Design a protein around this ligand. Structure first.
Ligand SMILES: CCCCCCCCCO[C@@H]1O[C@H](CO)[C@@H](O)[C@H](O)[C@H]1O
Ligand SMILES: CCCCCCCCCO[C@@H]1O[C@H](CO)[C@@H](O)[C@H](O)[C@H]1O
Ligand SMILES: CCCCCCCCCO[C@@H]1O[C@H](CO)[C@@H](O)[C@H](O)[C@H]1O
Ligand SMILES: CCCCCCCCCO[C@@H]1O[C@H](CO)[C@@H](O)[C@H](O)[C@H]1O
Ligand SMILES: CCCCCCCCCO[C@@H]1O[C@H](CO)[C@@H](O)[C@H](O)[C@H]1O
Ligand SMILES: CCCCCCCCCO[C@@H]1O[C@H](CO)[C@@H](O)[C@H](O)[C@H]1O
Ligand SMILES: CCCCCCCCCO[C@@H]1O[C@H](CO)[C@@H](O)[C@H](O)[C@H]1O
Ligand SMILES: CCCCCCCCCO[C@@H]1O[C@H](CO)[C@@H](O)[C@H](O)[C@H]1O
Ligand SMILES: CCCCCCCCCO[C@@H]1O[C@H](CO)[C@@H](O)[C@H](O)[C@H]1O
Ligand SMILES: CCCCCCCCCO[C@@H]1O[C@H](CO)[C@@H](O)[C@H](O)[C@H]1O
Ligand SMILES: CCCCCCCCCO[C@@H]1O[C@H](CO)[C@@H](O)[C@H](O)[C@H]1O
Ligand SMILES: CCCCCCCCCO[C@@H]1O[C@H](CO)[C@@H](O)[C@H](O)[C@H]1O
Ligand code: NA
Ligand code: NA
Length: 677
């Protein structure tokens, strides 16, 4: 059974019925007063989404182009909040624990995942430090109680190859002990010259039921990326416009192949302990330890040379980082009635502790011709080293009551967080050290009509430690998010279809801002994001499945000291939409065959915060064809062909500023063979 900390419910095709993302306890999506999306394993496989970030491309309120084609980190911009977008990811109910002030952000390979859940808007009441756009919760594959065996292989353009396995089953005749073991090896050249991606990973899991009341699940996840793909950008000047009659190529590499390394090792161990005390009382402990090593060498472009016409100026970043992090969450839940009201009352204590030891290097590199570059001039003039030890501790105590009474579904939550952040500059010996407390709250009310229509309203809050520091090196006050949301969900009690609309108004306060003059930031900035999201899952008779989305987002610097007050953040489309369909033939000659595809639309974006130049809009097309060869008498064998960006559009995905613009992925074609046995 076991509601606490579990999604439960069911999924069919692309549609899940329940989640725990918004509540830390299984709750129908239809009866949850927040916007929640779920991306199923089937959707991930059918769209050939090769990373978490790419899996989100059909979900509303999410921009998946922050660094264009790069696959090194998962950047999920939610409701237009791009800053600290690498810190939006949770895994098995626990913050991933990367350090967004360093190069040590972790990445979870999609092959380990059963599903991806997305919660929109401020959500600190259950999770503590987090961003005002929302957060993403990955659920890993868990042990199965019947023998399961899959082997999978892929080949594609851009030198892509991948082999994986996924084995699961009971170890004892009683089916009380079950294992899963998943492994993978993959590689790609990318679109970019001289670049490699490569990964090897293994994830063992063991689940043991001590009785009907207790389950312990033991988890390991070991991942080695000896190469890190591409993570660079070039000027707007020759991408969004010609530069002396030319455009920089979408395959251009601005670095030095002899001095281009990204080596990331992620070692995780953890456990989940689920204990039913009573039909009333349940308790759960989720734990994860993380230890990672990252080594980086990168020569990158930064603007055009003032003396040499078609050459880009370049610089060098170098890093050796070691991250350690502990995270535990302790939950105790009472479910009980008091006359006509049912209460699901949760109390929790969570604890995060992170240390990141970083040795950073930087310098000046030789200039490079942006067309016809000549590689090999890799000498760096180094600038002064910059070594730090960065520490974070967060303790949270939280309370939530889900109250169902008649057709009303109410949610009430409060959390107190004690946060301590320290940054020891090991080069200079000086130490910044700060401590503070924050209280966050949430209130939701939803009315469930018996035809399956559910209007709701939610008020919800968030906070996050400020990435900036003041006139004394001491970090500014944490940023804060506050959101009003009004929504409507619909599922007809018949259907395997689900439809939602959400309207939102988010304010983020204490954002760092400064006059151009000054060197010190103050926490007087404010950002406002408001808009509309529409999501539709329409599934007809187990052979035609559709998903579609529309997003309207109006985000603005409502208070800024730097000249940009009233401007729109860059990397924030006002309009996005998407539509994906998949058709399976089930009888007749063609049976076993499936055809699918979709289109994604991203509206215009500002290339810069000064709002002087637009990144054009783009529409991308995806397609798939699958065949179950079991129909020719080889059960468990199937093949598929995918093409993302089928028309091979060559475009700029977004820009961070006028200096750094990113190309979108070219056409990506993969062929896959899956063997069950
Ligand atoms: C956490 C990773 C653990 C990997 C486990 C190795 C694979 C399982 C070992 O073989 C299994 O032994 C059992 C009898 O003892 C049988 O039930 C089963 O039929 C048989 O195939
Ligand atoms: C669990 C079993 C794993 C099996 C391994 C599958 C293939 C892994 C591909 O790795 C590497 O890709 C690089 C980048 O393109 C190439 O430079 C290199 O030549 C190649 O060796
Ligand atoms: C303000 C108090 C904060 C809430 C405390 C939450 C306690 C939950 C601790 O974990 C659970 O507790 C059980 C104890 O019975 C054990 O089975 C096991 O440790 C785990 O399952
Ligand atoms: C609650 C028990 C968790 C302690 C061990 C892992 C915590 C994650 C960060 O590790 C760091 O390890 C250093 C060891 O030299 C110490 O400075 C200190 O422990 C901590 O800053
Ligand atoms: C062997 C590793 C697994 C251990 C399981 C940890 C038990 C859960 C209680 O967490 C504790 O919460 C406190 C908040 O008051 C922190 O101050 C303290 O440091 C932290 O440890
Ligand atoms: C059972 C959970 C209780 C909290 C556990 C953490 C140890 C006590 C925290 O003391 C300190 O108090 C300061 C102001 O008084 C806060 O601003 C700051 O964050 C914190 O360092
Ligand atoms: C954000 C919206 C606020 C909703 C207002 C609170 C509704 C309380 C739940 O009870 C409802 O209303 C009557 C109140 O007396 C009851 O008689 C009856 O049980 C039920 O119909
Ligand atoms: C295509 C556009 C779809 C619009 C989607 C948003 C619908 C939000 C409804 O929320 C409800 O609003 C009513 C009036 O306030 C009240 O019943 C209550 O306040 C609140 O529960
Ligand atoms: C538009 C989507 C539906 C939600 C509507 C709820 C009311 C929105 C207004 O919110 C408030 O507006 C003021 C603007 O300065 C401030 O009081 C504060 O910053 C903010 O909290
Ligand atoms: C479904 C397709 C409809 C497309 C209509 C084109 C409008 C594109 C909107 O760009 C936005 O225009 C605002 C001023 O109008 C700027 O504030 C905002 O800064 C900017 O991002
Ligand atoms: C499935 C999404 C299809 C939407 C494509 C929008 C076309 C371009 C409108 O031009 C904007 O002015
Ligand atoms: C649902 C399946 C749709 C199949 C897509 C048809 C287009 C096939 C052509 O693509 C190109 O093939 C080259 C090698 O032939 C690659 O090197 C190149 O990089 C790739 O762009
Ligand atoms: Na929400
Ligand atoms: Na990689």
């Amino acid at each position: 059974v076991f509601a606490l900390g579990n999604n439960l419910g069911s999924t069919d095709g692309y549609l899940a019925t329940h989640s725990q993302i918004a509540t830390k306890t299984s709750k129908p999506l239809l009866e949850t007063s927040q916007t929640v999306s779920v991306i199923t394993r089937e959707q991930i496989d059918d769209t050939a989404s090769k990373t978490v970030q790419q899996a989100m491309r059909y979900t509303p309120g999410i921009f998946t182009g922050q660094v264009g084609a790069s696959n090194r980190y998962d950047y999920v911009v939610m409701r237009g909040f791009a800053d600290n977008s690498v810190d939006n990811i949770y895994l098995d109910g626990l913050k991933a624990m990367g350090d967004s002030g360093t190069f040590s952000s972790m990445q979870v390979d999609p092959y380990f995942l059963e599903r991806i859940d997305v919660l929109k808007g401020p959500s600190s009441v259950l999770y503590g430090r987090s961003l005002p756009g929302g957060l993403v919760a990955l659920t890993s594959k868990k042990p199965l109680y019947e023998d399961y065996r899959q082997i999978t292989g892929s080949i594609g353009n851009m030198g892509q190859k991948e082999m994986g396995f996924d084995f699961s089953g009971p170890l004892d005749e009683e089916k009380r002990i079950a294992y899963r073991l998943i492994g993978l090896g993959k590689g790609s050249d990318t679109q970019f010259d001289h670049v490699k991606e490569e990964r090897y990973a293994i994830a063992p899991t063991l689940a043991i039921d001590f009785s009907d009341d207790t389950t312990l699940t033991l988890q390991g996840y070991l991942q080695h990326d000896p190469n890190g793909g591409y993570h660079g950008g070039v000027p707007a000047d020759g991408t969004l416009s010609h530069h002396n009659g030319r455009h920089i190529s979408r395959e251009f590499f601005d670095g030095e192949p002899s001095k281009d390394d990204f080596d990331r090792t992620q070692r995780m161990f953890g456990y989940q302990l689920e204990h039913r005390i009573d039909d009333v009382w349940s308790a759960r402990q989720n734990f994860r330890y993380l230890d990672s090593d990252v080594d980086l060498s990168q020569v990158y472009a930064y603007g055009w040379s003032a003396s040499e016409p078609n050459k880009l100026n370049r610089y060098f970043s170098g890093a050796r980082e070691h991250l350690q992090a502990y995270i535990v969450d302790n939950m105790l839940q009472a479910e009980f009635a008091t006359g006509a009201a049912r209460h699901t009352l949760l109390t929790g204590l969570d604890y995060q502790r992170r240390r990141t030891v970083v040795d950073w290097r930087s310098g000046s590199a030789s200039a490079l011709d942006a067309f016809n570059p000549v590689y090999g001039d890799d000498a760096i003039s180094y600038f002064p080293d910059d070594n730090h030890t960065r520490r974070l501790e967060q303790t949270g105590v939280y309370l939530q009551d889900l109250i169902d009474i008649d057709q009303w579904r109410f949610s009430l939550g409060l959390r107190q967080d004690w946060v301590s952040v320290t940054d020891k500059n090991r080069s200079t010996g000086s130490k910044a050290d700060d401590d503070w407390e924050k209280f966050t709250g949430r209130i939701g009310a939803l009315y469930l009509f018996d035809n399956g229509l559910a209007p709701y309203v939610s008020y919800s809050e968030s906070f996050n430690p400020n990435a900036y520091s003041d006139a004394s090196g001491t970090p500014l006050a944490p940023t804060e998010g506050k959101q009003w949301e009004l929504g409507l969900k619909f599922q007809a009690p018949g259907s395997n279809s689900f439809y939602t609309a959400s309207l939102f108004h988010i304010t983020q306060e204490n954002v760092a801002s400064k006059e151009p003059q000054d060197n010190f930031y103050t926490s007087v900035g404010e950002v406002r994001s408001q808009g509309l999201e529409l999501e539709a899952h329409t599934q007809l008779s187990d052979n035609l499945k559709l998903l579609g989305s529309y997003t309207y987002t109006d985000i603005t610097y409502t208070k800024s000291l730097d000249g940009n007050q009233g401007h729109t953040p860059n990397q924030a489309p006002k309009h996005m939409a998407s539509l994906w369909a998949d058709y399976a033939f089930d009888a007749g000659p063609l049976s076993g065959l499936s055809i699918g595809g979709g289109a994604r639309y991203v509206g215009e974006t500002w290339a810069d915060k000064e709002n002087t130049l637009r990144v054009p809009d783009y529409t991308l097309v995806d397609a798939r064809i699958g065949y179950d060869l079991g129909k020719l008498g080889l059960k468990g064998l199937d093949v598929s062909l995918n093409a993302n960006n089928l028309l091979d559009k060559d475009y700029v995905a977004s820009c961070y500023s006028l200096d750094f613009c990113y190309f979108g992925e070219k056409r990506n074609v993969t062929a896959t063979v899956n063997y069950q046995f």
